[PDB]
Structures are given as C-alpha cells and as structure tokens.
C-alpha cells in the first residue's frame, strides 16, 4: 500500500462526475527517473452507456470512493524481485476516471452531464508533480495499459511539449504503450452501429471524440483533418507521427481486439484463418517499430501484472527488453534486443504465455 493518493489541487480538472481527479505517488529520493502510469478500462461514448458505466464501474468515473493508497505491482513495484527494470524510480499511478481513452478536454456544464478531461488530467498531474520533485527528473516515462496504452500514444508528445514550454527541456519524455495498439480491421461477424454492443470501435471512437471534445496529437490531426481524428486512436496510424521514443507492448491475439472483432472463444476453418490473419496483421504493423514486445498469446495487459517478468520472446523478458531500450537511448547492442515480435501463428505457441 505504497503509493499514496493526491487529489488534484486544481479542482476544475475532474473525473466524469465532477469529483477531483488525482494520482497515487511513491517518491524515490535521489532517483531522477519518473514513471507515470495510465490505467485503462474501455470508455463510454453517449449518455446511456456512460450512465450504465456510472452504475457498475463507478471508480472509473469518479474519485469519491478511491482508497487512500494503492500497492504498486509489476512495473510499479519498488521491489527489484518483482520489477527488475525500474524498481528505484519515482512511481505514479494515474487512475482512469474520464472514460475517454485519455483524450477529452470538456468540463461538466449545463450542456454536458459528464466531464471528459483525460488529456487535461495528464497535463495537470505533470504540472503538480513538478513541485514534488519532477523538476529534477532526467527521464519521464509515460506508461499505460489497455486504454491507458492508447492514452500514452495520444499524450506522450503533449507531455513533452508541455515540459518544453514550462522550461524543462532536459527532461527526456518517453512512452511505454501496453495493450493499446488496436486495429480497425474487419469484424469476424458484422454488426451495424445501432447500440453500444454492436458499435465497432471506429464508429464508437468517432462518436466519442464529439461527445468528449477529444483531442489527438497535432501532427496526426494535421494528416487526417477534421472529422477523421478517430484515425489517431489507432496505434499504427498515430505512432509514425510521434517524436518521443515509444516502446510498444502488444499481445498478438489481444483479448480486447478479439472482443471488438466479435470473436468469442473447437475452432473451425473460418475462425482459424481469422485469428491467424489477425496475428499476421498485428505483426506487420510492428515491423518498423524498433522498440516493441509482441508475444503470440491471447491476453490483455502486461506491465502492471505481478508476474510480468515471466513472458519471454526469443528468450528475452519484457523487463530485459525495456532495460535494453534504456541502454539504446543513452547501433544495436549485443545480446540486448529491443525489437521482439513473435512469428509463430497461434495463441500460446509461445510457451511462456500467461496461464
Ligand atoms: O483496453 C481497454 O481498456 C478496452 C478496449 C479499448 O479500450 N479499445 C479496444 C478498441 C479500441 C480502439 C481505439 C482505442 C481504444 C480501444
Ligand atoms: C486548472 O485547469 C484548467 C483546465 O485544464 C486550466 O485551464 C487552468 O489554467 C488551471 N488553473 C490552475 C490555477 O492551474
């Protein structure tokens, strides 16, 4: 119970219901490395589905019931046994309470039942942490899992631009996007967008952006232009526009991807080919991503799981690959790879996949 809650001092930066957003912090005195982790957990995109989320997923929409501490797990653990990579870093967990894939910039008001302030929550956390030691940082790693991994892709360059404009050009901003690299592919079975369950991600994100006043990275926005900013929520389209170094972690057969593809798991030929094609398409999108870790498993999320050290690609674990990435950011390194993408074509053809 080692990260302590701080509600934002700027109480106009809020969770969906107007309660203050916040962050959990465990400082490491004398470390100059800061890890800011974005939680995930889907999204909502209209009044009716946000109301239902408010009933049964309220911690993702409000801080009113948040506990005063959380235990750091995985990459947020302070024990080297659990976190070989960054156990001595300053650790920040930012709860996801904006339901907008960390993209929103709209307040609750007479016109809006809910606030969607994900993009502003990240900016405000950064600004308040500067006074608590982040001003001395050498590396700020913005990490995130699930929708928080997409949030890294949408926000890492804005954090860099914010620190530059605040006069901290020496802080190196980097991103670690876990399980947020999705494909706008054909669904295995097809449903027109007539309610929440039938609405595919491209259409739900298109509606979400309008409902949230969602914002995307400027270079990506300039490519796709107005009405088409939903494209920037898809990693393979937004990543080439980014300037900050980003390490991408993605299971090849991601469970949330399969869910949005209407796949629910004795597999017959059509579904077999669908699954194999998904893994091939994911692998293809990572071909030119130099820092990546993509095991052939059916799962979702990795970096805050306590057993995150167990999975390996080509005999290299994720904490090792991240360490090699750090070294690369000081020509490739002998025996210390950073591009690790499985080539085998079926879930759990990698023996180290989670059980
Ligand atoms: O991982 C999560 O928390 C749930 C799934 C999620 O968030 N999805 C899946 C499809 C998609 C496209 C763009 C942005 C986000 C998402
Ligand atoms: C509070 O946050 C809002 C929204 O991001 C911002 O416009 C405003 O400048 C902030 N105020 C202070 C005092 O930080």
Residue numbers in the entry: 87 to 351, 355 to 419, 427 to 451
What text appears in the publication on this structure?
The carboxylesterase Notum hydrolyzes a palmitoleate moiety from Wingless/Integrated(Wnt) ligands and deactivates Wnt signaling. Notum inhibitors can restore Wnt signaling which may be of therapeutic benefit for pathologies such as osteoporosis and Alzheimer’s disease. The overall structure maintained the characteristic apo Notum fold, with a α/β hydrolase core domain (β1-8 strands and αB, C, and F helices) and a moveable lid domain (αA, D, and E helices). Notum, like many other carboxylesterases, catalyzes reactions by forming a covalent acyl-enzyme intermediate.
To investigate the structural basis for this observation, we first soaked Notum crystals with 2 and determined a 1.4 Å resolution structure. The electron density for the acid head and indole ring electron densities were obvious, but there was little or no density for the butyric carbons, indicative of a degree of disorder. The electron density for the butyric carbons was restored when 2 was soaked into Notum S232A mutant crystals, consistent with the disorder arising from S232 sterically hindering optimal positioning of the acid form. Superposition of these two complexes with the 1 complex shows the interplay between nucleophile position and covalent or noncovalent inhibitor binding, with a shift in the S232 Cα of 0.6 Å between complexes involving 1 or 2. Our complex structures of the acid form 2 with Notum or its mutant demonstrate that the indole ring forms strong hydrophobic interactions with the Notum pocket residues and remains within the pocket.
